[PDB]
Amino acid sequence: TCPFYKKIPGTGFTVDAFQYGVVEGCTAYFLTHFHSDHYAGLSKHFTFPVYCSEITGNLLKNKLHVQEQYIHPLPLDTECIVNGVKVVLLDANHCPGAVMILFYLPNGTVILHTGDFRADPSMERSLLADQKVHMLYLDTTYCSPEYTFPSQQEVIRFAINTAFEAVTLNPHALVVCGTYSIGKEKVFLAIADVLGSKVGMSQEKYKTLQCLNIPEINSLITTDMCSSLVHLLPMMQINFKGLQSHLKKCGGKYNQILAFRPTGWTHSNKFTRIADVIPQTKGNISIYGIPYSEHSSYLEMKRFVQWLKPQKIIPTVNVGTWKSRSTMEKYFREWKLEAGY
């Protein structure tokens, strides 16, 4: 059944709740972003109102075939009325089209639902600065102090410098980057820009990227693999067997692969700096795991929460075990005692 942390009290609304059938009492289904664990259940047979960003709405229409009459896109940073209730959509600094949702309840309560987010100090100057938030529905993916990772800018600098050195030393090297969802497009776009290439990919992945409103996208990507020296493959093919196989397919155009796997966190983060990362190598194939995150580090999450000073926190990630729930609740109380709210 639908868990309580997916329901917005005092409303007929749910958030990211499409896999439970008809949720009794729901008049509007919000979708924070186009990742499969969140849209699970949506298809061309859905007949209730879906509220989302413009970009998520493009993906619903083109990839899932949801009918246009049920897609309700909202502009960002704009007060809108939905079924009698004032709401605002804010950029979540996650994947393209991802939003946080501010609900202004008829009784005076204000609720922020972060969806999935990577907290940033820029959020402290959005429309959130302008009133008190009582209840926070929080993306707690990395809510433990071991989870450190570098800025996205540091990670892209590392990837650009590595790829440009390798291809200038060997003009017959191919660069491959893994993907299995939207998000993290800066990794493959920044590398192709330094190399003067388009990125090549499957017809399915090109269609997906053409829904994202990225400026000048026609100048940056292609379905013609032969013209490109940055290829995108499914994340499942980013291993020595998959990559040796791919190299066979390129008809002797290339004699070396340098591949990137943008993971979330991995425990080499507790010891190793970005400057010091090394690849796994077999023969003429090298694979780099780079810690490019689209979720908050522990410290970024803690700063956001201590700034916002909510009255009540409801975690939306890691809620399935008693040990995880107790750990999280201990951090929330630490933060509240340190900052004095």
User: What is the contact surface with Ni ion in residues (CB under 5 A)?
Assistant: 35, 116
Give the pairing of strands 71-73 and 50-52.
parallel
Q: Which two tokens stand for residue 37?
A: 């664990």
We find the least distance from the C-beta atom of residue 183 to Ni ion, in angstroms, to be 7
Nearer to Ni ion, 225 or 314 (CB): 314
Of 100, 60, 68, 104, residue with least CA distance to 86: 104
For 156, residues 6+ apart whose C-beta sits below 8 A from its C-beta are: 186, 187, 190, 292
Nearer to Ni ion, 35 or 198 (CB): 35
Nearer to Ni ion, 32 or 256 (CB): 32
We find the least distance from the C-beta atom of residue 60 to Ni ion, in angstroms, to be 15
- C-alpha dist (Å) from residue 113 to 84, 187, 235, 308: 18, 28, 30, 13
Nearer to Ni ion, 115 or 310 (CB): 115
We find the least distance from the C-beta atom of residue 264 to Ni ion, in angstroms, to be 10
Nearer to Ni ion, 5 or 104 (CB): 5
Query: C-alpha angle with apex 51: 45 to 53, nearest 5 degrees?
Result: 115
Q: How many angstroms separate the CA atoms of 328 and 280, rounded?
A: 35
The position carrying tokens 């750990």 is 327
We find the least distance from the C-beta atom of residue 94 to Ni ion, in angstroms, to be 6
Containing H/E element for 88? strand 85-91
Q: How many angstroms separate the CA atoms of 27 and 90, rounded?
A: 22
We find the least distance from the C-beta atom of residue 317 to Ni ion, in angstroms, to be 10
We find the least distance from the C-beta atom of residue 33 to Ni ion, in angstroms, to be 6
Nearer to Ni ion, 116 or 185 (CB): 116
